[PDB]
Design a protein around this ligand. Structure first.
Ligand code: LWY
Ligand code: LWY
Ligand code: LWY
Ligand code: LWY
Ligand code: ZN
Ligand code: ZN
Ligand code: ZN
Ligand code: ZN
Ligand code: ZN
Ligand code: ZN
Ligand code: ZN
Lengths: 408, 408, 141, 408
């Protein structure tokens, strides 16, 4: 019932310090005490965490757990069973890197959420988007330029990241469907992307009437809309139509970022995926015109991080890795810390991330009352982001809802 | 690549005796040498088997790997991912119990066959049937006596064991669909059964023209048809239409058994499943009017086995357990031995079983040329059947295609 | 052999007639093939082509096993003959040839894996063979 | 590679002169040098162009490539194979008449654009519209006054000029469909016309909400909308919604032209089609009620050209000929020159035309950096317009993207 971490170096993220020789006391699934006083441990089971960093469990705000290979066109067409199977090693690897919670950006449903919560499957807590919503010819339209046949399979394929739905009532019905299927939030494709063969990244997707409808039907279900957009043009219209988070956001202007502050909109950049698709683009089986499109978004990637920071736009942690590139997930910690410094790179995974998933008091912080999603780390992350960003080299313990899940 | 099992007592099922202190030599996935002579092991990896029985890994000719709970109507309605996830323990348990090869009688497909063969999932080698074929209101039709709306989802539900097809041309299309989907054989429902709402046991299912259509299209893909049948009336019509194996067959007369012998047809009795549904039928979620029907077939079960032996109809090993009752799987050995002697009961799962799945000489035998699907046994199964039928208490090594999978 | 959909999943190919790059269309059933033959003839065809066994350039069918039921092949043959023409039929093994010829097809395409028994039958039934050996060397190379 | 046109009379369109004995230096596909200074050619190929007009390749902003014959009813119903085949002489002829780029106004798809650019087909560069959008009973609706069955064959039939779409969500999807199929711009029927069965020229087509939905979707894929509109009433409503170019426009008032100037809306008047339809209308199989309808649009046709010039509305080149009437293509040069002067008539197919296709400073102007689409013209077009408008009687060399395509 009760577990004690002893002599830990507790990371207080808002105060920006390592509280050494602090004990974390856990009862069931929740943190009951943080103290430097000698704890009366009686019946309680103890883990000795002397001279090691105790910090909250990471929250990757942008994953594709069901992206078992780098070609998303071919990923959707794989058998339903095989699709499900192949996501299990991905989920297991994510947890052992420290990610106790993930926000799936398209693919994962409520079944995978239960699988992890029931303990039938090992891995992070999933906040599923269901399928992503995409227009015809959009970023989730993986049909060739050949000709157009109707896919009722868009919902049926468990390997499919997105579905194709168009029209105000069509997208309205789509949202109500995805919510009752069990989704925690709604994904949409608000602009062109890199993976889909048909659309350039410069141009916008969905009419403002569609986007507003999707927002309103998410808000009515006590949730929000996460939106894929690159250009500041596309980001402006998404946020003015009332989306809560912007994915990637690589090619913002400072006027677009100023509006995001002014609406209270978050951004989850995913810079580690483009640097992966640089070295291993068509090398891992992606279409050449997608690899030709990946060369341009990375350039203004680290640049945009400053732009959001100037404007005061809260930034979350995202990987967006596909297939065998999933192992590079922790590498985003490094990439972020270079530009913004480690404290802010750790805030992306913890306190900001937990606000994005609407679990502010519950997750991403070691406080009395919060869920026991904890990482025991060897060495200081504030003094060295390498103790986090070396494929999770220096994480020995992962605790999720009280119970210890990983030992290394 | 070269493995030597040394000093074990090889089971010869043709002769009916142990061949003691004989070595099995594996190269890759195949058996190259069965000898008692001082074998030369240069670059070979050895396991000491002295004083333990070496036998071929058992083959189950009737399982539902995807049947995760005893209500098959509710097993069909469960989400796809969750349906797949739940079969992974079932597969693993079967492999540990000693079953290296199972024949799925409706539920599993090509994806699960791929998952075990590439080594993505621990389990036995699957001979899938895809979805079983049932007529309207037949044994696969899990619709209640209320109303009839089209379940186009019959193919889409991964948890569903059967699809509902009617008509000579209609069933022809379904077979062609199932064969291209990748089924190894075709399963149909030729009578009423226990686990279905709207149908008594005594009556027959499908027309002879519908069965002949199915049989013809399976033969035209160089495979066979398995048919679910209970009564001698329902069995004889199926066998006259050219079905190769008859599943269950609890209520035969010797005339129907004589016809089976003459047509060269097989029987897979599944006696353990009725014993488990006798104790824990209504307990484990099965509807009361199904547990009503289970009483009337389990009576004649052991009596049928005698008739099959008398007419000389070849008998294969079948468990057919649903849900948590999958644990009882090995116990069918004990039941068959209690009526036929354990030489015959071991023949159910090795020699005769491999003939059924058309692997005569390739599986189910310890000979030069055969695949290395082997089991190492702590005792002599010829003496005591309980050394096999104790949920794998006395099995330490399970080898599958040359590689050792279970060490216990 | 005319179905080129992978082992993934099966939604309807209504495009099979519409796509001008498709060598084939999928049709099943005695009345389904009768309608198909009637369609192809009114479109302007001079002879009717069927796939009557497995082949090479299609993914989910071994060359050894036969395609179409004997009631389906007879329906096609008779609908071809009724429009004063004949049936050509893709067929490799002797087994697959014999049945097609016995259902009244006139020409056997490829026919690579004959025995003398099925060859004797074609002599008696007045059936032609079109071997196409040069494409097998090309695809090996 | 590198090619030099030497001693040519280079036509500067924005300054309105012939710079004689100026050489042109081509490298690969573009123009490096336009100068009179002596030509340094080590390893450079030379074409001797002494005392001949070197001028940029002509751009027609309204063709019908697939219009094999005058009746668009029977042009739609022709087979897909034969439709594509008959367009190949039609494309070839245009190129040999000095046309290096055409903008197809319905009919031609991305396939034909690929065929020219990968040199599989001799012809100009095509800027495809896909299919023209039309409402039911509209200018693209070629169904008679019999009855109405559903046409999903509109996209299927390759020889169909237009497809029939209705409704705000109907057109929104329609535009999305056409863009992913590879259209460079969107064509709509925004009033009645001549070659359709049911609509008079006086009445307008599509609601303001439909046109806006088409414009918003085209702008969202960084392109624009071309609209067929005759009357001043019909033109103004299309312009207020925001169509960028107006086709024909034969019946304008100056109020509508003033609005177009202010909204920056171009016009492509296609007068040469009506003169051909006056003498060869009933002669070439087009139904006599369409030949009755052509009586009024040709009158004000020349009269409209002055109105656009007066209100400052930019004017582009358009032939719009159908079938065998494609021979008459060059006639529009001479027709325009009589009203507006031959310098203005040469701007129509060069500098103004390149702005219409968004290729300003790339095509239609000889400059440093511009794509090498060049036409060698025997004689001076600034003096005699007949050197251009005599079915291309006085053109010998046509070069397209660096490489030479014609010799006469
Ligand atoms: C799975 P996704 O569509 O979010 N994605 C993969 C890499 C970058 C980004 C993109 O294609 O724009
Ligand atoms: C689904 P099934 O037909 O294999 N079956 C399950 C238990 C006994 C037998 C029955 O219902 O009669
Ligand atoms: C177009 P086809 O089906 O006649 N064909 C192409 C090469 C060999 C032969 C084959 O696939 O069996
Ligand atoms: C099909 P279209 O609108 O280009 N067209 C053909 C000839 C003139 C003009 C017309 O019908 O008004
Ligand atoms: Zn995205
Ligand atoms: Zn994503
Ligand atoms: Zn059964
Ligand atoms: Zn069964
Ligand atoms: Zn062939
Ligand atoms: Zn036109
Ligand atoms: Zn027009």
């Amino acid at each position: 019932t009760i577990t004690v971490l002893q002599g830990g170096n507790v990371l207080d993220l808002e105060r920006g310090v390592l509280l050494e020789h602090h004990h974390v006391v856990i009862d069931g699934e929740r943190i009951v005490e943080v103290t430097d006083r000698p704890v009366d441990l009686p019946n309680a089971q103890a883990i000795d965490v002397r001279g090691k960093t105790v910090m909250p469990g990471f929250i990757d705000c942008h994953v594709h757990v069901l992206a078992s290979n780098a070609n998303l066109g071919v990923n959707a067409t794989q058998p339903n069973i095989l699709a499900a199977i192949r996501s299990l090693p991905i989920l297991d690897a994510m947890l052992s890197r420290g990610f106790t919670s993930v926000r799936d950006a398209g693919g994962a449903d409520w079944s995978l959420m239960q699988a992890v919560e029931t303990g039938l499957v090992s891995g992070p807590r999933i906040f599923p988007s269901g399928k992503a919503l995409s227009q015809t010819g959009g970023h989730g339209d993986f049909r060739p330029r050949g000709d157009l046949l109707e896919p009722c399979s868009c919902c049926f394929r468990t390997g499919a990241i997105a579905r194709v739905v168009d029209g105000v009532e069509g997208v309205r019905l789509a949202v109500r469907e995805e919510i009752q299927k069990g989704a925690t939030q709604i994904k949409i494709m608000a602009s062109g992307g890199v993976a889909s063969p048909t659309d350039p990244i410069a141009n916008t997707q969905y009419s403002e009437d569609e986007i507003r409808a999707i927002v309103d039907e998410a808000e009515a279900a006590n949730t929000y809309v996460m939106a894929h957009a690159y250009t500041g043009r596309a980001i402006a219209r998404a946020v003015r139509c009332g989306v809560r988070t912007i994915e990637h956001g690589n090619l913002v202007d400072e006027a677009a970022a100023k509006l995001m502050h002014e609406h209270g909109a978050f951004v989850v950049p995913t810079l580690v995926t483009y640097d992966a698709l640089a070295k291993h683009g068509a090398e891992f089986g992606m279409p050449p015109e997608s690899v030709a499109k990946v060369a341009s978004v990375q350039q203004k990637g680290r640049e945009s991080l400053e732009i959001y920071a100037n404007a005061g736009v809260k930034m979350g942690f995202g990987s967006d890795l596909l297939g065998e590139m999933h192992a590079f997930q922790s590498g985003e910690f490094r990439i972020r810390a270079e530009v913004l410094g480690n404290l802010e790179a750790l805030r992306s995974a913890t306190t900001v991330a937990a606000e994005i998933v609407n679990m502010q008091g519950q997750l991403g912080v070691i406080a009395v009352g919060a869920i026991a999603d904890l990482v025991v780390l060897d060495g200081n992350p504030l003094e060295d982001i390498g103790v986090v960003a070396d494929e999770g080299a220096r994480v020995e313990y992962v605790l999720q809802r009280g119970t210890l899940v990983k030992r290394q």
